Structure formats: C-alpha cells, structure tokens
Amino acid sequence: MQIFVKTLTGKTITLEVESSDTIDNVKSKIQDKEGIPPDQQRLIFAGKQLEDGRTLSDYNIQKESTLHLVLRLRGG
C-alpha cells in the first residue's frame, strides 16, 4: 500500500509502506526523500494527527490515502 503526502508548499510525495508500517517510519522516509526536518514535519489524516509510534491500522488509514505534512513551527 502507498500513501500520498501533501506538503504545504505544493509538493506531492508517494511513499511505499506495508500494513505493518508505523508513523515514525514514514517521517524518516520523507527526510531521506526530500529533506523536510523530521523534528518539525507532522503526519495528518482526516484532520487527526497521526501520533508517532502507532501503526497505520490504528487510524483506519486506507490505501492511496491523502496524507498531510505540516511542520511544528516555532513560536516560543
């Protein structure tokens, strides 16, 4: 199964994962893919942010799902 990540810059990313993949893994893939800071980028689906550690089945993440990637940003 593959996922379509959407950056807030207008870039589409197609990643290849399994039914046993995890969020944390997706982030690393994107980092080695383009270079988006892992400590900033965050996975989102249906509005709900995918908590790092859990799998894709815990969020009913279907196939070819439209995932989003938003940075943590700084405002302290």
Partner 1 sequence: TTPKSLAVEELSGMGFTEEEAHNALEKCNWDLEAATNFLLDSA
Decide if residue 13 touches partner 1 (CB under 8 A). Answer: no
3-class secondary structure, 58: helix
> How far apart are CB 49 and partner 1 at their closest, in Å?
5
The values of phi and psi at residue 30, to 5°, are -60, -40
| Closest separation in Å from C-beta 76 to partner 1 | 13
22 CA to centre of own chain: 10
Sequential DSSP letters for 9-39: TS-EEEEE--TT-BHHHHHHHHHHHT---TT
Q: State the binding string over 15-54 for partner 1 (x if CB under 8 A, else -).
A: ---------------------------x-x-xxxx-----
Summarize as ranges the residues that interact with partner 1 (CB under 8 A). Answer: 8, 42, 44, 46-49, 68, 70-73, 75
